[PDB]
Nucleic acid binder design. Structure first.
Lengths: 260, 140, 188, 58
RNA sequence: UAAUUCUAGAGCUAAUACAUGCUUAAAAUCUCGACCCUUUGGAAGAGAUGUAUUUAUUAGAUAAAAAAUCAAUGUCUUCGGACUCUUUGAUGAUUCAUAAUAACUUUUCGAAUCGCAUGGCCUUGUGCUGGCGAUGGUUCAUUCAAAUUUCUGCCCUAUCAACUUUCGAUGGUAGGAUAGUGGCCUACCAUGGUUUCAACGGGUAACGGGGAAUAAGGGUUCGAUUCCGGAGAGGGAGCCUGAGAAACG
RNA sequence: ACUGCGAAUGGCUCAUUAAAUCAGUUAUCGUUUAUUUGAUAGUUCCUUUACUACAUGGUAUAACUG
């Protein structure tokens, strides 16, 4: 090519959006924004393929232009604005508040939360540096920079952000035995706790995570998102709570539950 | 000997004040390479100047790590390494031998004759055909 | 134009390569600017991105630097004596990096008397109050003051003039000067 | 008529002037408080690492 | 003027076009130094300090204890001066981030823009303050990208056994050029680099992969063609405008 | 009609090309980046308010008339 690309074809669209392969020829292509391309979800896949409120594209623009939909206490009208992990989607004419978080089979789940949990947001720590005129800042996974932190924060920790003023309340370190979400790969959406973490110099470091039913697995370091101390998260988890169920176990658990 | 080239030779931005006097020879500068590698004795207290050395020059080491035997030392500050493997052919269920030569760079801290076996690490492009330089050595 | 591809050379084997695409704009060269001495002529070229470079077509002054004292003043330049790449730039007096020129020594000498009060070669009470302070740091190397009778120092250029536009540098000192002066008066 | 004085243009340069004074006042406010936290955190660090030397004395 | 998205002369008036150009807290610290009359002095006054550009030189600590010492001093003066005194980020790894000192420059940026509302305070002057948001702006981060690069992997052919190096082929040193590394190009030097584990040359009615037909097992034969990657716009070469093209509506 | 943005995406073909393309895999401590999202700018009349506007400086042209 010569410049940037601007169309996304239909079969090349990311799989966990679940667009059906016969309705059109192209998919929505997500704008450049806070979250990466194949790790996010536009506002048109939310408002017509999950909540079933709108039936077209022409209906979604009619919703967005009435200035209903906010993200993180700020109004958006970009019809493919890229909402990603841990974002808060506050409609107003229904008094519903949502939070983007992962399913267990690997999907973005519809999650309703309260009116008080929708005042804050976690975020991990991607780098910490010394800026111009000697002040330091910190970069989160969604790209917020925040100057003047505590000195005890290091990288791969987790901050808590107040969405009103854009500030920090407290923070969680990163060591053995913590509650951890997994945000990328194969064991995607499972919740467990840290056994220990071995390190390879000049390579990709591996953590070992134990479930609650005590079965273990291994992922790279960067697909690991700290949530809280053991038995106590800071957010409202979905049903199943990140427990991997074998396919044998979930036929008959659907069978015996089938009593309607 | 160390001044044979037609322009003056120095680790740049390393200043000697003649007004002061201190019984050191010259303020040499030297770094630690990383990855559990050990800077040799003859680099910290040696007297050569080389632009492209891992312990003295301005190159980094990152990327791969290889290993192989040295088969030609006929250039000035480069050698050639031979590497040997096998290759599997599925229909016949068997292996066949192959090889590839790589050229690397040799700092004058090391003394490498033919027949030895070195380990080498990767740096940014040094010449037309060079992307590695030696970081350890073990004899024959 | 001048392109910087490696697709026109031969392999490490000697095998002659093949014509693969047409010539791409993002591998280009421009023309070498030779930098004469004279009145100020500086032209601006436009680069990748919206940036800017200043080509110097001829200039005459600079901004040179005394290391051991730590003072950098603005002077004039006179002519090049030595260039280690080819000696067809000394016979034309271009201006590259690593070129060895001569400057006029006047504002360094005029600074030196103001800082110390001592001559080179051969009255308020504030002044000798602090001239007495800078007493031990008075003397310098012999072989560098020994050209203050002529006002022609020896200095090398450390800025690329074809890129940055300017032409600055630093004074030769005795360790480096011992090398070049043995090179200067023997290779001719 | 273009480019005339007008009350509509008048308070715009008031609000623009009022912005960066009220803005940049808060920085040196907030910078001092950050150094205030760093001030006390070193103060215990002089004491709390001396207590190892109290134990190294014992 | 036979003519084409061809255009000449004369006369008007605008800008987020083009060209210029003011406003503002206090603090500290440096250099110069009127005087002063003195010991061991202290001083009026003056100027300098945003950011960006280019060069030079310093800080960017850290493995375990105690004296003798040369003086100086913070201090109770014990007028002995013994002492009753230090901070410092990140990486496997840096000349890293970031800070200071001298300067330097055909001197870069630091809102002479626009819609809505219309209020609070008064000595009531069109006095003084004051809401929501559009567009522009320098640098660091970020997202969509781009440019190069490491390891291993291709069909038939010896009726192709030696190939490359003037005219760069393989390496060293210094410059030029570029967004940037590099024989990418130019100077001086060295004589290297590939090969029976098939180099180099010849054929291809050869764009590469995901994949397709047949199938006990092993396999044989296809892939111009709905997805991702490259190349091209009658054949070669050259450049303009732009963040981005060697572009062909 | 001036100014701003886009026209470098998309669509079509398979001629060249046999260590090239291309695949799975690394690297940038070796570089440019419109846009988007988040931070970010009292110092700039000669001046610390002395002549010389900040209740706001100057020309030139388009469409249009002839």
């Amino acid at each position: 090519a010569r410049g940037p690309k601007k169309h996304l074809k239909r079969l090349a669209a990311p799989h966990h959006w679940l667009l059906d392969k016969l309705s059109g020829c192209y998919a929505p292509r997500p704008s450049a924004g806070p979250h990466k391309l194949r790790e996010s979800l536009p506002l048109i896949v939310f408002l017509r393929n999950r909540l079933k409120y709108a039936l077209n594209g022409r209906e979604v623009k009619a919703i967005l232009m009435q200035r209903h939909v906010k993200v993180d206490g700020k109004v958006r009208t970009d019809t493919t604005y890229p909402a990603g992990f841990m974002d808060v989607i506050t409609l107003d004419a229904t008094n519903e508040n949502f939070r983007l978080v992962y399913d267990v089979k690997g999907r973005f789940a519809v999650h309703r939360i309260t009116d008080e949990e929708a005042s804050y947001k976690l975020g991990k720590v991607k780098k910490v540096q010394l800026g111009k005129k000697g002040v330091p800042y910190v970069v989160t996974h969604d790209g917020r920079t925040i100057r003047y932190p505590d000195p005890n924060i290091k990288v791969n920790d987790t901050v808590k952000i107040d969405l009103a003023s854009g500030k920090i309340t407290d923070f969680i370190k990163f060591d053995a035995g913590k509650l951890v979400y997994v945000t990328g790969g194969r064991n995607l959406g499972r919740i467990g706790t840290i056994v220990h973490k071995e390190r390879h110099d000049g390579g990709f470091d591996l953590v070992h995570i134990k479930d609650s039913l005590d079965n273990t697995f291994v992922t790279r370091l960067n697909n690991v998102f700290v949530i809280g101390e053991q038995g106590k998260p800071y957010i409202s988890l979905p049903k199943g709570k990140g427990i991997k169920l074998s396919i044998a176990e979930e036929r008959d658990r659907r069978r015996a539950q089938q009593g309607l | 000997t160390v001044q044979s080239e037609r322009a003056f030779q120095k680790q740049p931005h390393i200043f000697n004040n003649p007004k002061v006097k201190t019984s050191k020879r010259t303020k040499r500068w030297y770094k630690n390479a990383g990855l559990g590698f050990k800077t040799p004795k003859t680099a910290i207290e040696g007297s050569y100047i080389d632009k492209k050395c891992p312990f003295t020059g301005l190159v980094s080491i990152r990327g791969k790590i290889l290993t192989g035997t040295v088969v030609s030392t006929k250039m000035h500050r480069t050698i050639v390494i031979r590497r040997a493997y096998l290759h599997y052919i599925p229909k016949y269920n068997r292996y066949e031998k192959r090889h590839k030569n790589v050229p690397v760079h040799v700092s004058p801290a090391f003394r490498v004759q033919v027949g030895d076996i070195v380990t080498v690490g990767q740096c940014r492009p040094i010449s037309k055909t060079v992307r590695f330089n030696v970081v350890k050595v073990s004899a024959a | 134009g001048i392109s910087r591809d490696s697709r026109h050379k031969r392999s490490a084997t000697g095998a002659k390569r093949a014509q693969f695409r047409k010539k791409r704009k993002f591998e280009l060269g421009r023309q070498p600017a030779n930098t004469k001495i004279g009145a100020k002529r500086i032209h601006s070229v436009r680069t990748r991105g919206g940036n800017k470079k200043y080509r110097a077509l001829r200039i005459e002054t600079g901004n040179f630097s005394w290391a051991s004292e730590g003072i950098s003043k603005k002077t004039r330049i006179a002519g090049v004596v030595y260039h280690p790449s080819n000696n067809e730039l000394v016979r034309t007096n271009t201006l590259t990096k690593a070129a060895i020129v001569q400057i006029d020594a006047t504002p360094f000498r005029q600074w030196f008397e103001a800082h110390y009060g001592q001559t080179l070669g051969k009255k308020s009470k504030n002044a000798e109050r602090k001239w007495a302070a800078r007493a031990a740091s008075a003397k310098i190397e012999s072989s560098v003051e020994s050209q203050f009778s002529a006002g022609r120092l020896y200095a090398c250029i450390s800025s690329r003039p074809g890129q940055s536009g300017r032409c600055d540098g630093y004074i030769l000192e005795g360790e480096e000067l011992a090398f070049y002066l043995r090179r200067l008066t023997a290779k001719k | 008529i273009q480019r005339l004085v007008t009350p509509q243009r008048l308070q715009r340069k008031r609000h623009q002037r009022a912005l960066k004074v009220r803005n940049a006042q808060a920085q040196r406010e907030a910078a001092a408080e950050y150094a205030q936290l760093l001030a006390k955190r070193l103060s215990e660090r002089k004491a709390e690492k001396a207590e190892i030397r109290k134990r190294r004395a014992s």
